[PDB]
Amino acid sequence: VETFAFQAEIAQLMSLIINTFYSNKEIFLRELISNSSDALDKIRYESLTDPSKLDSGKELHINLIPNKQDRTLTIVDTGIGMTKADLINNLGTIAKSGTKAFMEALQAGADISMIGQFGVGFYSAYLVAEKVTVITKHNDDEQYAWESSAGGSFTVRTDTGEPMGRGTKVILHLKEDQTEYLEERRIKEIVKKHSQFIGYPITLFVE
Numbered sequence: 001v002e003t004f005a006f007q008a009e010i011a012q013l014m015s016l017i018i019n020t021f022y023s024n025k026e027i028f029l030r031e032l033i034s035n036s037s038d039a040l041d042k043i044r045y046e047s048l049t050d051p052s053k054l055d056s057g058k059e060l061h062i063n064l065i066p067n068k069q070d071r072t073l074t075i076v077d078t079g080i081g082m083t084k085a086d087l088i089n090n091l092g093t094i095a096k097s098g099t100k101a102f103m104e105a106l107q108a109g110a111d112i113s114m115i116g117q118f119g120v121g122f123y124s125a126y127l128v129a130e131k132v133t134v135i136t137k138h139n140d141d142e143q144y145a146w147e148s149s150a151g152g153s154f155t156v157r158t159d160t161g162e163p164m165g166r167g168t169k170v171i172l173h174l175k176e177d178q179t180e181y182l183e184e185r186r187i188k189e190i191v192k193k194h195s196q197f198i199g200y201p202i203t204l205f206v207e
């Protein structure tokens with residue numbers, strides 16, 4: 001298990017997300033489904049020049065898996081996935097600029113719901129989750145587990161769990177007062193409101 005400090009601006013945004021009073025918490029799901037759709041668009045596009053990139057799985061979809069017993073909401077996609085270098089350096093380097101721009105926009109009157117315009121919508125997961133676990137598998141790398149309970153640090157390890165084939169699985173360990181996001185009717189309403197035109201099948205698993 002390797003422990004890393006988040007870039008200062010990212011840690012700052014995570015504290016702002018956790019500490020700001022903001023009732024419209026449901027936007028976290030739109031943001032995560034969007035990121036899934038982008039990873040799916042990426043593998044679809046790449047497989048046009050290299051069809052072998054779909055050897056790890058041809059199906060392009062999103063699964064929404066609530067678990068009341070574990071108090072977890074899992075968002076699974078069969079997108080391009082992420083390499084170790086993406087999880088540790090690449091995505092965070094880029095997110096540094098988006099994060100700074102977003103925090104400046106909030107100071108100028110913008111709302112937390114506009115987070116996606118700055119490419120840092122992922123951090124909206126901390127509106128509802130005390131801990132986020134990300135399992136990922138890219139064709140060019142091994143399966144990794146990224147994890148953070150905020151507090152300025154995250155961990156990355158090789159994942160010895162069930163092999164994913166290709167894609168990303170976001171496991172949200174929900175805050176005790178955010179269990180409405182495990183309810184089928186609540187998840188259906190959010191998907192219909194914010195993610196109605198996503199170009200991939202979104203399957204909501206029932207318990």
Ligand SMILES: CN(C(=O)c1cc2c(C(=O)N3CCCCC3)[nH]nc2cc1O)c1ccc(N2CCOCC2)cc1
Pocket residue numbers: 032034035036038039040077079080081082087091119120121122134136146167168170
């Ligand atoms: C390739 N890819 C993924 O496989 C993937 C990443 C996800 C995150 C996330 O953002 N993570 C999770 C781990 C810590 C870093 C952040 N959340 N849900 C995700 C679902 C996914 O399929 C990916 C997809 C979209 C993006 N951004 C969209 C917005 O513009 C900036 C790039 C970046 C990478």
